[PDB]
Amino acid sequence: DYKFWYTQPVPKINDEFNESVNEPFISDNKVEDVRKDEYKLPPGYSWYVCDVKDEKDRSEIYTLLTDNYVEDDDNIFRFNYSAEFLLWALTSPNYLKTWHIGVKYDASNKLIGFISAIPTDICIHKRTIKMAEVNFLCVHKTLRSKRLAPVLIKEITRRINLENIWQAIYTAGVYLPKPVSDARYYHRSINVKKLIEIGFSSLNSRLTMSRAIKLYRVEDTLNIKNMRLMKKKDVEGVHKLLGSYLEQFNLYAVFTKEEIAHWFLPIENVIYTYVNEENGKIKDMISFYSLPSQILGNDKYSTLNAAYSFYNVTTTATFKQLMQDAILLAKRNNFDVFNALEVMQNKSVFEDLKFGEGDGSLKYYLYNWKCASFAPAHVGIVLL
Ligand SMILES: CCCCCCCCCCCCCC(=O)CSCCNC(=O)CCNC(=O)[C@H](O)C(C)(C)COP(=O)(O)OP(=O)(O)OC[C@H]1O[C@@H](n2cnc3c(N)ncnc32)[C@H](O)[C@@H]1OP(=O)(O)O
Ligand SMILES: Cc1n[nH]c(C)c1Cc1nnc(-c2sc3ccccc3c2OC2CCNCC2)o1
Ligand SMILES: [Cl-]
Ligand SMILES: [Mg+2]
Ligand SMILES: [N+]
């Protein structure tokens, strides 16, 4: 029925647009007309402005997400974004603290809901638009199906519109009106044995434990011998290499140098970026972020460490050789599995590099934007 989504400027379930349509649902919006009152919460709940730079406010958001955020379909894994990852994800250039919105239960003073946005320039079918990237919408498990989520959504929309921004980008595993693209995820086992023991991977009479371990063995030698952790001197080179690469896609963020520095400079247990420099020029890059999942009800293991393919560009090797090196660098950093979406050129290497198809897919959405949908190979952005 989508009783809430149908009141919003997003496509109806049956809407399909020609490649030539690329425009808002509602144009000529006026900042002066935006509501100045906060949306009403049910009795006993209050808005709270989170300070993600304050360790203790950041720890509250962390706890709320650790306990109540996204699980896989079978409720075996729940994402466990670290506190330091949340700092990086929310404090990108020109971020607004007022777009990091909590909801507390007054009587306990406990955070029970959150939603966030950061500003980014998004190019959709060759038109670049200032947008908000929305993420970390979460309502405590005890308060589900009370229609709190549309309150969170309408309040962040209002605060975004105060900044004269009228479009947003977001991703979800659930189907909503109406994806612009849908990308399945794939997984490449690194610590085979652990993945078998927690239920993620399987054996059979052909594939015994020892044979599974040998199937996924990797050689500890890079195809691109000089691939090294990115350093601040590499920001201009990464900006040129990535910025050029991304223009081929139907949907991508347009990064400034500031943004390159924030989204790529390495941070242990958060973001890993490697580069290959030749004559002071960056010719190849690999990047993946750390997103562990908490393992629910396994006696032996509590955490699955997982590296998430982010942006990868090669000019001196084949894309397969580059992604093989990305797997190796993940293995060198203690990750159990390497996860990738079928975006950009990724799908082309999955069979050869022994990726297995996962359980589900990630839907990409835009708010207040009408356009043709497209295959995920034409998606050139990866959200957190
Ligand atoms: C111009 C600026 C524009 C800015 C805003 C752009 C839009 C931003 C939109 C947000 C983007 C976030 C992206 C992002 O964070 C990444 S996707 C991860 C979302 N978070 C989780 O899955 C965490 C675990 N689940 C929860 O915490 C709750 O189930 C949530 C809070 C999801 C819903 O709480 P609830 O207690 O289960 O449900 P009610 O309160 O009763 O609300 C039901 C209404 O919520 C609609 N719903 C459910 N899940 C949704 C989802 N993932 N996106 C959008 N809408 C979602 C649902 O269809 C229904 O509407 P309908 O009746 O029409 O069908
Ligand atoms: C809960 C869980 N534990 N382990 C799994 C697999 C899942 C299910 C799942 N949901 N999204 C995904 C994937 S794979 C993936 C691979 C590369 C890049 C992004 C993603 C991605 O999305 C990102 C970005 C949007 N925000 C959530 C995380 O994977
Ligand atoms: Cl309303
Ligand atoms: Mg609710
Ligand atoms: N996301």
- What residues does each domain of the chain span? 1-384
Ligand 2 closest atom vs CA 308: 17
Question: How far is ligand 2, taken at its centre, from the CA of residue 72, in Å?
Answer: 9
Elucidation technique = X-ray
Q: E strands within 59-180?
A: 77-79, 100-105, 110-124, 127-139, 167-172
| Ligand 1 neighbour 138 (Cβ under 6 A) | yes
The protein residue whose alpha carbon is closest to atom 9 in ligand 1 is 153
| Ligand 1 neighbour 139 (Cβ under 6 A) | yes
CATH of 1-384 among 3.40.630.170, 3.40.190.10, 3.40.50.300, 3.30.930.10: 3.40.630.170
Question: How far is ligand 2, taken at its centre, from the CA of residue 384, in Å?
Answer: 8
Task: For residue 140, count CB atoms less than 10 angstroms from its CB and return exposed for 0-12, middle for 13-18, buried for 19 or more.
Answer: middle
Question: For the chain, how big is the Rg over CA atoms in Å?
Answer: 21
Contact 364, 183 (CB under 8 A): yes
Question: What is the bridge-based pairing of β-strands 100-105 and 77-79?
Answer: unpaired
Question: How far is ligand 1, taken at its centre, from the CA of residue 300, in Å?
Answer: 33
Contact 263, 118 (CB under 8 A): no
Helices (H), the chain: 55-68, 83-90, 148-161, 192-197, 209-215, 235-246, 257-264, 319-332, 347-350
| Ligand 5 neighbour 254 (Cβ under 6 A) | no
Other beta carbons within 10 angstroms of residue 10's beta carbon come to 20
| Ligand 5 neighbour 383 (Cβ under 6 A) | yes
Q: Which residues are CB-contacts of 175 (< 8 A; sequence separation ≥ 6)?
A: 363
| Resolution of the coordinates, Å | 1.7
Q: Which residues are CB-contacts of 216 (< 8 A; sequence separation ≥ 6)?
A: 188, 189, 190, 192, 354
Ligand 2 closest atom vs CA 72: 1
Give DSSP secondary structure letters for 244-290: HHHTTSSEEE---HHHHHHHHS-BTTTEEEEEEEETTEEEEEEEEEE
Q: Which residues are CB-contacts of 217 (< 8 A; sequence separation ≥ 6)?
A: none
Question: How far is ligand 1, taken at its centre, from the CA of residue 347, in Å?
Answer: 28
| Ligand 5 neighbour 201 (Cβ under 6 A) | no
Instruction: Give the single-character DSSP code of 154.
Output: H
Q: Which of 190, 85, 74, 185 is nearest to 136 (CA)?
A: 85
Question: What is the bridge-based pairing of β-strands 110-124 and 100-105?
Answer: antiparallel
Q: Which of 35, 51, 45, 64 is nearest to 147 (CA)?
A: 45
Q: Which of 64, 70, 134 is nearest to 104 (CA)?
A: 64
| Ligand 1 neighbour 177 (Cβ under 6 A) | no
Q: Which of 277, 238, 270, 280 is nearest to 255 (CA)?
A: 238
As given in the structure block, the two tokens for residue 375 are 């295959």
Contact 48, 111 (CB under 8 A): yes
CA angle, 301 then 302 then 304, to 5°: 85
Q: Which of 95, 107, 108 is nearest to 49 (CA)?
A: 95
Contact 5, 176 (CB under 8 A): yes
Q: Indicate the helix (H) or strand (E) that contains 46.
A: strand 45-49
- How far, in Å, are 213, 215, 236, 310 from residue 323 at the CA level? 20, 17, 23, 11
Which residues lie across from 186 on neighbouring strands?
Answer: 340, 357
Binding residues for Mg(2+): 143, 299
